[PDB]
Structure 1
Amino acid sequence: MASKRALVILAKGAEEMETVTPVDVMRRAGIKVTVAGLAGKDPVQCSRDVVICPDASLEDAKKEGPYDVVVLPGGNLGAQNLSESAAVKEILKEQENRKGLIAAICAGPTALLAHEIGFGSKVTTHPLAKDKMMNGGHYTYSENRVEKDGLILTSRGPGTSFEFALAIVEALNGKEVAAQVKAPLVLK
């Protein structure tokens, strides 16, 4: 069986912890992860000024799908960039149409609202992003640290990144792989 594949969409102003922790944990799980730069191949200046070099442009990575999961990091400005992108809209609608997992953390879920993805689901967000996500009442809000309603998997903040990433691993590779990846991490 072929390894599962993840697309992580990296925009200027993304929360770097919410990019790096899921990428790292998914690679620990033996998932083939592509960090794709929204704007192109060039390095991306994250919210706290960490600069990450993407594996590929989104323009190129989006031709190499499909992916088992599409991951949207948070950060207020990163999520706003994801929300404004027609390319992101197309990728998310294709993923939803093929019944593939979509995972978003912190402010990231607000890009689901912008692109009309997953309406009628239970979702969580960062507390400060709740009102934006809930505009129109298209989702039902949850305060769970990770929330999964079918193929929409959401989480709250930097401090839920491990839980979020391990939930992706469990969904793709099963509970046993998630448990094995978790143990060396020294999680509380």
Structure 2
Amino acid sequence: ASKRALVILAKGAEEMETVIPVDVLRRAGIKVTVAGLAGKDPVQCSRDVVICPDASLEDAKKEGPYDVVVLPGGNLGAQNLSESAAVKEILKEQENRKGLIAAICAGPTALLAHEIGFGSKVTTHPLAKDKMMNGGHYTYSENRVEKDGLILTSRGPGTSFEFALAIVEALNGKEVAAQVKAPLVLK
């Protein structure tokens, strides 16, 4: 069967970090559900792009499991993900069932909030390092994309393509990732 991805979309999410992975994952033939943290209604992103989710997280979470759970960044978006008991449950289940978790920019700080993947190497946006590293529960990396087993992290809007292609490679392999990459006109 086709792989499935859950992208959790909260108010204040970085819209580039949401749309690039959704689009690239769909190019890879992955079934992506854009799930609204707050419910079914349109979501106002950090730079005021308004995105209509495919489903509420409440509904989407009952349609698991997913091959990857994707956490976009955006400072406020990531704070909303960090405060969510529903997100906690989803991430813990994903970690338990040995499933990929991918987070970008401020997104990885939600892993800290929910105590996910301690002892991994991770990266974040430079400005999110101190939050992520509070307590020394991870080892910090400056790689544009970092992958330590099932914890896949990345740095910012400008690393979103690399982040998304790394998810494609992890799920569908290097050849599919290369095939999806070529038409994008990446440098």
Give TM class, smaller chain: over 0.9
Specify every segment of 5 or more residues in structure 2 that has no aligned partner in the other structure, as ranges. Answer: none
In the TM superposition, what is the alpha-carbon distance from 1:41 to its structure 2 partner?
0.1
In the TM superposition, what is the alpha-carbon distance from 1:100 to its structure 2 partner?
0.0
Number of residues of Structure 1 aligned to a counterpart in Structure 2: 187
In the TM superposition, what is the alpha-carbon distance from 1:40 to its structure 2 partner?
0.1
Instruction: Please identify runs of 4+ aligned residues in structure 1 that moved more than 3 A.
Output: none
- Partner of 1:34, secondary structure, is strand
In the TM superposition, what is the alpha-carbon distance from 1:141 to its structure 2 partner?
0.0
In the TM superposition, what is the alpha-carbon distance from 1:64 to its structure 2 partner?
0.2
In the TM superposition, what is the alpha-carbon distance from 1:149 to its structure 2 partner?
0.1
Q: Distance in 2 between matches of 1:87 and 1:131?
A: 25
In the TM superposition, what is the alpha-carbon distance from 1:125 to its structure 2 partner?
0.1
Q: Distance in 1 between matches of 2:112 and 2:74?
A: 16
CA offsets 1:66-102 (integer angstroms, 9 cap, x no match): 0000000000000000000000000000000000000
In the TM superposition, what is the alpha-carbon distance from 1:25 to its structure 2 partner?
0.1
In the TM superposition, what is the alpha-carbon distance from 1:184 to its structure 2 partner?
0.1
- Partner of 2:77, secondary structure, is helix
TM-score normalized with structure 2 length = 1.00
CA offsets 1:14-34 (integer angstroms, 9 cap, x no match): 000000000000000000000
Q: Distance in 2 between matches of 1:61 and 1:172?
A: 20
Q: Distance in 1 between matches of 2:89 and 2:65?
A: 12
In the TM superposition, what is the alpha-carbon distance from 1:57 to its structure 2 partner?
0.1
- Partner of 1:128, secondary structure, is helix
The match for 2:185 is 186
CA offsets 1:128-184 (integer angstroms, 9 cap, x no match): 000000000000000000000000000000000000000000000000000000000
Structural mapping, 1:90-109, within 5 Å: 90-109=89-108
The match for 1:89 is 88
TM-score normalized with structure 1 length = 0.99
- Partner of 2:130, secondary structure, is helix
Give the percent of matched residue pairs that are identical in Structure 1 and Structure 2: 99
Q: Distance in 2 between matches of 1:64 and 1:158?
A: 29
The match for 1:30 is 29
In the TM superposition, what is the alpha-carbon distance from 1:105 to its structure 2 partner?
0.1
In the TM superposition, what is the alpha-carbon distance from 1:111 to its structure 2 partner?
0.1
Q: Distance in 2 between matches of 1:148 and 1:127?
A: 17
Q: Distance in 2 between matches of 1:159 and 1:50?
A: 18
In the TM superposition, what is the alpha-carbon distance from 1:7 to its structure 2 partner?
0.1
Q: Distance in 2 between matches of 1:129 and 1:64?
A: 31
